[PDB]
Amino acid sequence: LSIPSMLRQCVNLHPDGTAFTYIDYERDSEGISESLTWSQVYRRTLNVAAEVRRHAAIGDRAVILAPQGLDYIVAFLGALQAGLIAVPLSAPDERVDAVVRDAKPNVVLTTSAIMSPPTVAVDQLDLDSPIDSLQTTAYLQYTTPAGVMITYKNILANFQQMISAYFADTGAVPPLDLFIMSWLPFYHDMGLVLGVCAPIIVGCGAVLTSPVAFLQRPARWLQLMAREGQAFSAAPNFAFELTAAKAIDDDLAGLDLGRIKTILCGSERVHPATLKRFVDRFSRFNLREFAIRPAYGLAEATVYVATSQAGQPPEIRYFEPHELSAGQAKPCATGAGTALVSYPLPQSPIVRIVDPNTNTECPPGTIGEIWVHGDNVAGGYWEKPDETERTFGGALVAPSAGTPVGPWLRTGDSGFVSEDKFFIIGRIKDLLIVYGRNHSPDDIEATIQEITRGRCAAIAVPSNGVEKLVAIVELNNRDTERLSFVTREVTSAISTSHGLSVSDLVLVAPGSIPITTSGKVRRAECVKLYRHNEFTRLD
């Protein structure tokens, strides 16, 4: 039924089986491993549960403000065990403070190394001392801050959808020696569902580390995935880029990547050229290319919406770019126009492309907003009726045959269907509209990112009633001419490959463009930093 009861059943079936292994790289750059069997993580969970029942009642929120590691896991699991709504946050910002005010927690779970409601340092609890839950709301997944309410029903449904789609070629049964491997942060939906929940729900073990460790030496990702068994992992697109760029072959001495079962690529636009570099670079170590699975979803859907066909490598389709910017997907020849990853229309949940101004499905090939319906779709945002209604209350006008009327999750993403596959253009609010045509930041950035090889951000800045293109461009500092080579180069490439004039090319130092913990650009941030003149230009 719930995560706590599934955790207890893991304990009955395999008390001494390994459950969680955390590889810490902070003191020893080669890694220090610490591991918990099912019994051991259950004991700690129960001790955390008892400490938390002293400060808070069933139904209260419990904020988790710990660094990545084993204590985070038993803080979250212990909150669920005691019937609290867990609120996974990062370790200290201002967001953290606004989430606490929104969630009004009756307890905080933290660690001594970082410090009204009672704060608990779970590492200073006697967690291994020897020796209830809700059936509905498990935790709030925070993005003004809005916390997605995730129920056990949401979780169970997405896992049925995920296990069915990911393991369709083996009859929805994962292999006996599957293990999970993740460096994604536990306070993001991908990292929480994969790293903390999935080991319990699937009945497999997890090998875990921090996003900070991965960004230091991206080879550690490949190394830990190559451990004994068939690895299941996930990462954003540019983490594929980074690993392809920074890993050294001697770090990969005698690594066998041919047992890796799945690496999801999701949480941002999946670029075929990144995927091609990753497979070209690492096919030498037997990385099977059917192991790579583009995956689309969002926190409002718990995590999963759609993925590539199991047992095949990613499928790429090509469309006319000018037609795309005009709102129409016109297929073209392999290598022409713009390339997009094919996503098979999922069986569960279901996807529709919908005109956001008329609440009516688009004809195939017409670009509109991606709408989602299914039991994995959350019931709303915590204590936000109005915003819940705006985001979760999609109602279809004159639904097509078999298509439910509602309620539909409005994803905020632009996309289209072609040949019973759908494609994702990008986030609507990040699109650059010039002369009635929509252009995608992800495509412009690829254009720049090939000449720069540094990071990018293509943003729209309103001025006197139109949108102007501005490009924040990271670049390596270690003369005045090359700088004007790059300016000339990037400006022309955008013009020749997009028909756009760049109003402003902001050449900055590496690390000036804001990025996620997983490393993804923040485009709405980039905008008002530009608008409040907060960027320093290499001139």
Ligand X SMILES: Nc1ncnc2c1ncn2[C@@H]1O[C@H](COP(=O)(O)OP(=O)(O)NP(=O)(O)O)[C@@H](O)[C@H]1O
Binding site for ligand PLM (CB under 6 A): 162-163, 189-190, 193-194, 198, 202, 232, 234, 264, 266-267, 295, 297-299, 303-304
By beta-carbon proximity to ligand PLM, the closer residue of 117 and 313 is 313
By beta-carbon proximity to ligand PLM, the closer residue of 216 and 348 is 348
**Which amino acid type is present at position 495?**
S
N residues, the chain: 539
Instruction: Tell me whether the omega of the peptide bond preceding residue 385 falls within 30 degrees of 0, making it cis.
Output: no
In DSSP terms, which residues pair with 439 in a beta bridge?
432
Question: What is the nearest approach in angstroms of ligand X to the Cβ of residue 242?
Answer: 16
Kindly indicate which of the ranges 105-113, 123-131, 206-214, 409-417 contains the residues binding ligand X, using the contact rule CB under 6 A. Answer: 409-417
Among 21, 111, 267, 449, binds ligand X (CB under 6 A): 267
Question: What is the nearest approach in angstroms of ligand PLM to the Cβ of residue 502?
Answer: 28
Q: What share of the chain is helix, strand, coil (3-state, %, to 5)?
A: 35, 25, 40
Among 266, 368, 380, 519, binds ligand X (CB under 6 A): 266
Question: What is the nearest approach in angstroms of ligand X to the Cβ of residue 45?
Answer: 26
By beta-carbon proximity to ligand X, the closer residue of 339 and 483 is 339
The answer to whether 520 contacts ligand X (rule: CB under 6 A) is yes
Query: Restricting to residues 176-195, which ones interact with ligand X according to CB under 6 A?
Result: 189
Distance (Å, rounded) from C-alpha 428 to C-alpha 407? 21
Distance (Å, rounded) from C-alpha 67 to C-alpha 75? 11
- Using CA atoms, how far residue 296 sits from 97, 111, 174, 308, in Å, is 30, 34, 20, 9
Among ligand X, ligand PLM, none, the one that 279 touches (CB under a kind-dependent 5 to 8 A) is: none
The answer to whether 295 contacts ligand X (rule: CB under 6 A) is yes
Distance (Å, rounded) from C-alpha 82 to C-alpha 54? 10
Among ligand PLM, ligand X, none, the one that 264 touches (CB under a kind-dependent 5 to 8 A) is: ligand PLM
Name residues whose C-beta falls within 8 Å of residue 384's C-beta, 6 or more positions apart in sequence: 146
Rg (CA), the chain: 23
Residue corresponding to tokens 């839950």: 133
For residue 160, how many other CB atoms are within 10 A of its CB? Answer: 15
Q: Of 459, 90, 147, which Cα lies nearest the Cα of 300?
A: 147
Among ligand X, ligand PLM, none, the one that 48 touches (CB under a kind-dependent 5 to 8 A) is: none
Among 51, 60, 71, 413, binds ligand X (CB under 6 A): 413
Residue corresponding to tokens 């390596």: 476
- SS3 state at 258: coil
By beta-carbon proximity to ligand PLM, the closer residue of 52 and 270 is 270
Among 427, 439, 455, 498, binds ligand X (CB under 6 A): 427
The answer to whether 60 contacts ligand X (rule: CB under 6 A) is no
By beta-carbon proximity to ligand X, the closer residue of 7 and 157 is 157
- SS3 state at 381: strand
Among ligand X, ligand PLM, none, the one that 269 touches (CB under a kind-dependent 5 to 8 A) is: ligand X
The answer to whether 455 contacts ligand X (rule: CB under 6 A) is no
Among ligand PLM, ligand X, none, the one that 271 touches (CB under a kind-dependent 5 to 8 A) is: none
**Which amino acid type is present at position 373?**
H
Question: What is the nearest approach in angstroms of ligand X to the Cβ of residue 55?
Answer: 30
Distance (Å, rounded) from C-alpha 428 to C-alpha 426? 6
Size of interface with ligand X, in residues (CB under 6 A):
18
DSSP state of 363: P
Query: Restricting to residues 113-172, which ones interact with ligand X according to CB under 6 A?
Result: none
- SS3 state at 189: helix
Distance (Å, rounded) from C-alpha 186 to C-alpha 195? 7
Question: What is the nearest approach in angstroms of ligand PLM to the Cβ of residue 501?
Answer: 32
- Residues in contact with ligand X by CB under 6 A are 189, 266-270, 294-299, 411-413, 424, 427, 520
